[PDB]
Symmetry: D2
Subunit: 233 residues, 4 copies
């Protein structure tokens, strides 16, 4: 009944949307969950909503020392990580003409740099046979107006799942990317989507759950599109 019974999960991007829905689903499947976020107020609200088996940890995953501190807390409280959902992400639209160095740095710092170190520093805590899930995007395989840096960053994320699959296979750690389409969160995409609607965060959490759980035990390095068919037709 409980597909993550007694597993320990860390979820970055934990206060908002997908992170939050995933946290609830993970708890419902009997996991212990750390949610991670920059803003303490929202994190505590998120933990309140989740209600049980959850620790909120304030961290800016773009800052190495914030990561060290998060992992020190995770080690003290629960020892080991079974499931890491690296889901922090931020989108700002700018066309090629409009790109400034600050815009470039913001996007790649949060989407790629932050991710790399999030995963690097989780390594000593990750259990052999554990599962790592990266949040890429349908943007990583599309040519969307003004999504230059975001799409490019998200393609870099999908690439990391491949590389990390190779590098961590000795320890049997699976790494897979999830690529959401339009998810209803805090009509153009809905028109082009075969399912004819935006996804619910619950539906994304459910896909992440697959990758987190034993059901995906022979699935490695993939990009799982969860986009109602958008990129598939």
């Amino acid at each position: 009944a409980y597909r993550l019974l007694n597993k320990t999960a860390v979820i970055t991007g934990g206060n908002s949307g997908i992170g939050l829905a995933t946290a609830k689903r993970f708890v419902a499947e009997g996991a212990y969950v750390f949610i991670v976020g920059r803003r303490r107020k929202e994190l505590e609200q998120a933990a309140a909503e989740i209600g049980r088996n959850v620790t909120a940890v304030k961290a800016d995953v773009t800052k190495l020392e914030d990561l060290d501190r998060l992992y020190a807390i995770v080690r003290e409280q629960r020892g080991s990580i079974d499931v890491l959902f690296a889901n922090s992400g931020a989108i700002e639209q700018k066309t090629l003409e409009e790109i400034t160095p600050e815009h470039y740095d913001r996007t790649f710092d949060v989407n790629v740099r932050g991710l790399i170190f999030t995963v690097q520093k989780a390594l000593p805590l990750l259990r052999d046979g554990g599962s790592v899930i990266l949040t890429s995007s349908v943007a990583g395989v599309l040519g969307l107006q003004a999504h230059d840096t975001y799409s490019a960053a998200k393609a870099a994320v999908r690439s990391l799942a491949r590389t990390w699959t190779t590098e961590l296979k000795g320890r049997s750690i699976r790494v897979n990317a999830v690529s959401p389409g339009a998810i209803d969160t805090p009509a153009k995409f809905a028109a082009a989507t075969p399912l004819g609607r935006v996804g619910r965060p619950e539906e994304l959490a459910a896909a992440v759950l697959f990758l987190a759980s034993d059901d995906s035990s022979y699935v490695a390095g993939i990009e799982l599109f969860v986009d109602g068919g958008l990129t598939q037709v």
Copy 2:
């Protein structure tokens, strides 16, 4: 606890390997399952092993009238299909030089022709919001010695999931392809696979369960690789 409670599932290629393991997993998740196969002896043994909530139906999915008969039986016994796992398939190795018209016809009849009609004739029984899973293969995206017709057929299968996604969206029927790598069934592949081993049929069944269940409700038209990383790195 029961992810397919009271759902009706049809599984072609039902007596052997993947089909069998999927049937057990589906029953364990509270589904009613029809297994389909050419050989009555093996089918009845398969149904024996499954043990409950199962009807064995003798049919050659390459023969239209056998399909009509199968769906008549399904209609009488259970009325509607929630989950169709079109998994009949057959591999014969021949290089390009060796290809005979009989070889070509065998491969495409069982892998593509059979499949098309299996799905066409299920349409009137398929519930709105139901889920169809096609069995493609890693071969469909590789250049394997002597796999000419098989690989090409399996690439045709993957294509059909895209087309049917578009055509069946009005009825909310999801169609998705599963692409197994090496599965242990009735060392070359295991060497190149990041997970360093062949997959267990149970592991493939678990992937098909994802696509069958509500957890994949926003997943449509995809090719889900279940190959331990073989085609991803």
Copy 3:
């Protein structure tokens, strides 16, 4: 100046559209060209338009003996094949509901079966280091209404390029697939296409020329999309 000087080229689907434009461009680059077609009248007109260094050969590439005859003629006239452009293809639209066995057989006979034998029988005439080009389609990676069998067949074509790449590498024969989008030949696609127009057959011929010529000497097994960006964004 002449990128195919004294090379011998065979082009199936030789009377119409892409076949014809490729034939002209090949002749312009100093090739000797066989065009192949079912209808003698049109073939002779095509040969008239091409004007020089061309033999028209009547053949139904779906019929093995027609192939044997074509290759006997090619052997008698020029001895060897440097470039084989297997470009025979036919599209009929039918939804899944509408598919009849005749429709299925027509599409797969012309698109896949014919192609397999066209290339099988060219093998003894193909020069080591030669270049084979298969005509797939953007349909082979899309979910287009009523294109069920065509898209699936074209996906089987793209797969054959990969297999044949592996099988023929010992003889250094390159096999590559070209995937046209909308080509003006004997507004929906033009709208979705970044270049905002259908392609001219000359533009497709130019892409096939790349694959035919030494310029693509380190390109093998690829799917070259010539679609103004349709499948790429």
Copy 4:
């Protein structure tokens, strides 16, 4: 005879390997060529070997003002750009464990940040109907030990071809990515490659030529693999 007659071409990563070979092939096809590099000595040697119709420009493409300076010189000497080959790249191997912030910044600065600004600042000089070629890599779709940041950066590059194809279509500028496999430049890859050898730089220059020339006039947003079939089988 001259596929780039009187066109003006800008080539970053100009002094070494692929940059160099491409410069030679461009001049041979009647182009005027600017090569761009950090080291003045090697640039001048490169210019010497090319021999005619070439200007060497010292610039660090990671530095905005260096780009401004480059483009001012191009504007003074030739006015406009027909072909931009953005080909500056640098590889350093580090596993996930070994990644430092400096290694991350080095790789992304040269491969992605540099590229974005190279193309941004070319825009005012680029001719309508011109052609931009990006250097990606086979790494951008593989999982290669210790290629973490390089592979991820090269995936970001291939994504930018898709985005820029959409943003620049109004001006009819084509953007395409070239993805080399193993190129002989200043046995593991050669073993897995169907062509059984590493590629010569000339062979990569020839592929870039295709994308640069009118032959590829209907090809947009693609990833052109020039890898002997490495990623295709």
